[PDB]
Amino acid sequence: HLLSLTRRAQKHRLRDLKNQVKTFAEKEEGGDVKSVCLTLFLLALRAGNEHKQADELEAMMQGRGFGLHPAVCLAIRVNTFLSCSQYHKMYRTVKATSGRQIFQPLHTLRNAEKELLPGFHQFEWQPALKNVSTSWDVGIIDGLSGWTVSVDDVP
Amino acid sequence: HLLSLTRRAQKHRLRDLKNQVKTFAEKEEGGDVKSVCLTLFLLALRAGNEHKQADELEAMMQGRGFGLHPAVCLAIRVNTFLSCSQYHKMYRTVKATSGRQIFQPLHTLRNAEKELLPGFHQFEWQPALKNVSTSWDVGIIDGLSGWTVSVDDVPADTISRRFRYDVALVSALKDLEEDIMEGLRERALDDSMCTSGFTVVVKESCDGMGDVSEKVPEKAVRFSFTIMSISIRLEGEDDGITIFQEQKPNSELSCRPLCLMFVDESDHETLTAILGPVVAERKAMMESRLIISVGGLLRSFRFFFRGTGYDEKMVREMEGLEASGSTYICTLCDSTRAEASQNMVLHSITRSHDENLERYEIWRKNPFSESADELRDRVKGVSAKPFMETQPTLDALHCDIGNATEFYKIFQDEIGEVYQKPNPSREERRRWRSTLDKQLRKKMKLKPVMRMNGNYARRLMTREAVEAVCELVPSEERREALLKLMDLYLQMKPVWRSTCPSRDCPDQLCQYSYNSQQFADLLSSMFKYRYDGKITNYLHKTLAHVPEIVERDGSIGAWASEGNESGNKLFRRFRKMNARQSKTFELEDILKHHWLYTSKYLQKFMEAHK
Ligand SMILES: [Ca+2]
Ligand SMILES: [Zn+2]
């Protein structure tokens, strides 16, 4: 059978249909046989109802790519209530699993996220604010607002 | 352009060369349009020197599948306590963006796991097992065993879920299939023959679980087991060639649960009436031999069971002892309590299961017509009939905790005066405690806890913490005395904490007799004021039976019950995240998740090249 042979034998056996597809592409698709056999394999997998492998192939051929955007991963983390530790756990898992750094690790996710929190964008107010510190880049404050902690007064 | 059209228009355009490919593949290649156009595309890619794309396509349309292996996917899912909806959201999300679906859907795992659960793998026994329905495919089973629900009789209320031991064992073993074949090949031993002399030593361990926040009282008991070692006896003429010994059995990552009962530890009635079948089939198991498909071949098995991982209270309770601090203390040497203070080191280990049955028959029949105490002595204190056979050994963990709390008490004592104070009061005891705690906080950075666990014990045993304690003793003679005591204890401790001292630390074993002897003598001399006749059990064991068992049973610490107790936190958190939630199922699914978490296969997928 064809799939058990080397390149030499399969060329020797398919030469006829190779010339057939070459001349059909030259007559209709400009002689670019690679895109023609790509589309034909895609359609033959579409008919075989194995959409999954054909879609993975189109992800290989001019596909969106392996990398996941760090922001989207931060999302899928928060939207799912997962940990910090557990995130890193499954991260190292998939990392050593299939050859790629599919998720970003923690610290880069943290860095990428720190802009999405409050206190990152610079701005102004016209006129300036009423009795408000013009400091902007600040993040999370403690709510007591400098409540003098001395026991003598109200706790 | 062909790439921007829809599939309908692309077919309307390419159908002609399509049907030419159809007729060519039928003329020459058995009508395989799929493989024909596959190799056509492969060679058209390889012609342009685009070797990476063609190699990746050859890797995709063979062997590995869609981006991740479904097995490792389920491994992650269980390894981090995610929910179904959790997983579906994650999967749907990551598939939306840049998908190219990666994780696997839920439904596929919902039957992909059935390899790792019990009740999948063919097997049998020669001879056939006694009293066991020989269906090899049943999975999770309610433990009640068809208790007639008649409220007339004793009520059948206690909830439980368990397995059939055999099915559990075949699942665990056929999971180890990989490792045992690997070890067989490493030793270069033949693979076709030697399919009959495999011997498996399996450790079992059970323990209750206190204060389980309930969602019946708040209790529960979990009975698990763990594969320990496996060797080969074929062809004979030798001992068993060690094939694979487990590399770290203490860690709960190897503690396979088998039964769970929402019941309390102490009420003998319920515990027994649920454990019954388990005991029965483990007993019948020593007799027959096992036959499994392994390495593609039918291979045989024998077994050796060891009941070691039980805390004291349960051991003494199930071996028919007077629980627990009664005039008979040692589970091995039948000397009295006070006598255990006169002699400490010289003793023989005698207690055995069958002979305890003999002594209990003597207790029942009373063939000598002796009174209460005379009969108590003639059987050396065996009242209740044991039913679960147990190995003659102690625990590692809670001997550690007992020595730790003993030194804790004696430190609370020597901070003040004891040889100088014949009878102190409660106030001074709590005060010496308080200054000891302040000392452990200022130095060594140790706040106290309610009761000292294993970590706090490891810390309190340390030498310089004993120095920070002894700083406060007025008499420097007593200070150097308990320091010398501590040094002897530390030189003797990793004797039993080890995995294999004959390999790790043989030197302490070689000098253990004299060490423990001089230890006990210093104790009896400079601390007689306190240990006239009152000795705790663990102190007895560690000074009366350590070398006997360590020489006999190969190793110790290798049979630590701790392996289970710690791991019980999982039964805690599994309860939160993956409750059914309703008890009658809650158990069943908890156990399923647990056994799934604990199988090797998934741990192999999790470690993932260091
Ligand atoms: Ca326990
Ligand atoms: Zn003893």
PDB file of N, CA and C in Angstrom, chain B residues 74-106:
ATOM      1  N   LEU B  74      -7.150  14.421  31.009  1.00  0.00           N
ATOM      2  CA  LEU B  74      -7.861  14.004  32.211  1.00  0.00           C
ATOM      3  C   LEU B  74      -6.940  14.026  33.425  1.00  0.00           C
ATOM      4  N   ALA B  75      -5.659  13.711  33.215  1.00  0.00           N
ATOM      5  CA  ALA B  75      -4.677  13.768  34.292  1.00  0.00           C
ATOM      6  C   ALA B  75      -4.608  15.163  34.894  1.00  0.00           C
ATOM      7  N   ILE B  76      -4.504  16.183  34.041  1.00  0.00           N
ATOM      8  CA  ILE B  76      -4.549  17.561  34.525  1.00  0.00           C
ATOM      9  C   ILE B  76      -5.850  17.804  35.277  1.00  0.00           C
ATOM     10  N   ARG B  77      -6.979  17.460  34.644  1.00  0.00           N
ATOM     11  CA  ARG B  77      -8.292  17.775  35.206  1.00  0.00           C
ATOM     12  C   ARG B  77      -8.413  17.271  36.635  1.00  0.00           C
ATOM     13  N   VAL B  78      -7.961  16.042  36.882  1.00  0.00           N
ATOM     14  CA  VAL B  78      -8.034  15.508  38.232  1.00  0.00           C
ATOM     15  C   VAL B  78      -6.904  16.028  39.101  1.00  0.00           C
ATOM     16  N   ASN B  79      -5.792  16.435  38.500  1.00  0.00           N
ATOM     17  CA  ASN B  79      -4.663  16.829  39.313  1.00  0.00           C
ATOM     18  C   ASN B  79      -4.857  18.202  39.926  1.00  0.00           C
ATOM     19  N   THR B  80      -5.861  18.949  39.475  1.00  0.00           N
ATOM     20  CA  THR B  80      -6.060  20.292  39.991  1.00  0.00           C
ATOM     21  C   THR B  80      -7.525  20.571  40.297  1.00  0.00           C
ATOM     22  N   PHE B  81      -8.303  19.529  40.604  1.00  0.00           N
ATOM     23  CA  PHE B  81      -9.568  19.698  41.322  1.00  0.00           C
ATOM     24  C   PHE B  81     -10.550  20.584  40.564  1.00  0.00           C
ATOM     25  N   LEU B  82     -10.555  20.487  39.246  1.00  0.00           N
ATOM     26  CA  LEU B  82     -11.515  21.302  38.527  1.00  0.00           C
ATOM     27  C   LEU B  82     -12.838  20.584  38.377  1.00  0.00           C
ATOM     28  N   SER B  83     -13.885  21.384  38.240  1.00  0.00           N
ATOM     29  CA  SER B  83     -15.222  20.860  38.061  1.00  0.00           C
ATOM     30  C   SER B  83     -15.483  20.568  36.591  1.00  0.00           C
ATOM     31  N   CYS B  84     -16.608  19.897  36.355  1.00  0.00           N
ATOM     32  CA  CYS B  84     -17.078  19.682  34.996  1.00  0.00           C
ATOM     33  C   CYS B  84     -17.287  21.014  34.291  1.00  0.00           C
ATOM     34  N   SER B  85     -18.230  21.825  34.789  1.00  0.00           N
ATOM     35  CA  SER B  85     -18.477  23.140  34.203  1.00  0.00           C
ATOM     36  C   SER B  85     -17.189  23.942  34.106  1.00  0.00           C
ATOM     37  N   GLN B  86     -16.364  23.885  35.153  1.00  0.00           N
ATOM     38  CA  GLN B  86     -15.027  24.463  35.104  1.00  0.00           C
ATOM     39  C   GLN B  86     -14.312  24.054  33.829  1.00  0.00           C
ATOM     40  N   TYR B  87     -14.174  22.743  33.648  1.00  0.00           N
ATOM     41  CA  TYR B  87     -13.412  22.244  32.520  1.00  0.00           C
ATOM     42  C   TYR B  87     -14.055  22.645  31.205  1.00  0.00           C
ATOM     43  N   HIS B  88     -15.383  22.603  31.133  1.00  0.00           N
ATOM     44  CA  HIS B  88     -16.047  22.926  29.881  1.00  0.00           C
ATOM     45  C   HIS B  88     -15.828  24.382  29.510  1.00  0.00           C
ATOM     46  N   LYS B  89     -15.912  25.281  30.489  1.00  0.00           N
ATOM     47  CA  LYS B  89     -15.635  26.686  30.216  1.00  0.00           C
ATOM     48  C   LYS B  89     -14.211  26.856  29.708  1.00  0.00           C
ATOM     49  N   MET B  90     -13.238  26.293  30.433  1.00  0.00           N
ATOM     50  CA  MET B  90     -11.840  26.388  30.013  1.00  0.00           C
ATOM     51  C   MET B  90     -11.652  25.882  28.585  1.00  0.00           C
ATOM     52  N   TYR B  91     -12.185  24.694  28.305  1.00  0.00           N
ATOM     53  CA  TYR B  91     -12.026  24.061  27.003  1.00  0.00           C
ATOM     54  C   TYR B  91     -12.681  24.886  25.908  1.00  0.00           C
ATOM     55  N   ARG B  92     -13.964  25.213  26.081  1.00  0.00           N
ATOM     56  CA  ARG B  92     -14.663  26.034  25.105  1.00  0.00           C
ATOM     57  C   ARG B  92     -13.888  27.304  24.813  1.00  0.00           C
ATOM     58  N   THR B  93     -13.362  27.937  25.860  1.00  0.00           N
ATOM     59  CA  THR B  93     -12.619  29.175  25.689  1.00  0.00           C
ATOM     60  C   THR B  93     -11.390  28.955  24.823  1.00  0.00           C
ATOM     61  N   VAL B  94     -10.476  28.107  25.295  1.00  0.00           N
ATOM     62  CA  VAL B  94      -9.213  27.936  24.599  1.00  0.00           C
ATOM     63  C   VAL B  94      -9.426  27.390  23.189  1.00  0.00           C
ATOM     64  N   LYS B  95     -10.563  26.730  22.935  1.00  0.00           N
ATOM     65  CA  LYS B  95     -10.872  26.265  21.585  1.00  0.00           C
ATOM     66  C   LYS B  95     -11.376  27.402  20.705  1.00  0.00           C
ATOM     67  N   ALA B  96     -12.140  28.331  21.282  1.00  0.00           N
ATOM     68  CA  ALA B  96     -12.578  29.500  20.529  1.00  0.00           C
ATOM     69  C   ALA B  96     -11.384  30.241  19.941  1.00  0.00           C
ATOM     70  N   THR B  97     -10.476  30.691  20.800  1.00  0.00           N
ATOM     71  CA  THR B  97      -9.307  31.450  20.375  1.00  0.00           C
ATOM     72  C   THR B  97      -8.170  30.510  19.996  1.00  0.00           C
ATOM     73  N   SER B  98      -7.605  30.724  18.805  1.00  0.00           N
ATOM     74  CA  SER B  98      -6.466  29.963  18.289  1.00  0.00           C
ATOM     75  C   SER B  98      -6.744  28.465  18.228  1.00  0.00           C
ATOM     76  N   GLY B  99      -8.015  28.079  18.139  1.00  0.00           N
ATOM     77  CA  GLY B  99      -8.412  26.682  18.111  1.00  0.00           C
ATOM     78  C   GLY B  99      -8.975  26.302  16.750  1.00  0.00           C
ATOM     79  N   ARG B 100      -8.482  25.188  16.179  1.00  0.00           N
ATOM     80  CA  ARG B 100      -7.407  24.299  16.669  1.00  0.00           C
ATOM     81  C   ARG B 100      -7.615  23.731  18.079  1.00  0.00           C
ATOM     82  N   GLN B 101      -8.665  22.928  18.244  1.00  0.00           N
ATOM     83  CA  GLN B 101      -9.016  22.433  19.568  1.00  0.00           C
ATOM     84  C   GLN B 101      -7.841  21.682  20.182  1.00  0.00           C
ATOM     85  N   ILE B 102      -7.606  21.941  21.463  1.00  0.00           N
ATOM     86  CA  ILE B 102      -6.446  21.419  22.176  1.00  0.00           C
ATOM     87  C   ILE B 102      -6.866  20.463  23.281  1.00  0.00           C
ATOM     88  N   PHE B 103      -7.588  20.962  24.279  1.00  0.00           N
ATOM     89  CA  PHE B 103      -8.021  20.094  25.355  1.00  0.00           C
ATOM     90  C   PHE B 103      -9.085  19.134  24.836  1.00  0.00           C
ATOM     91  N   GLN B 104      -9.386  18.152  25.627  1.00  0.00           N
ATOM     92  CA  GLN B 104     -10.428  17.352  25.016  1.00  0.00           C
ATOM     93  C   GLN B 104     -11.770  17.650  25.663  1.00  0.00           C
ATOM     94  N   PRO B 105     -12.859  17.462  24.920  1.00  0.00           N
ATOM     95  CA  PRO B 105     -14.187  17.694  25.493  1.00  0.00           C
ATOM     96  C   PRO B 105     -14.443  16.785  26.686  1.00  0.00           C
ATOM     97  N   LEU B 106     -15.546  17.066  27.368  1.00  0.00           N
ATOM     98  CA  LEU B 106     -15.846  16.337  28.591  1.00  0.00           C
ATOM     99  C   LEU B 106     -16.307  14.920  28.285  1.00  0.00           C
TER     100      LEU B 106
END
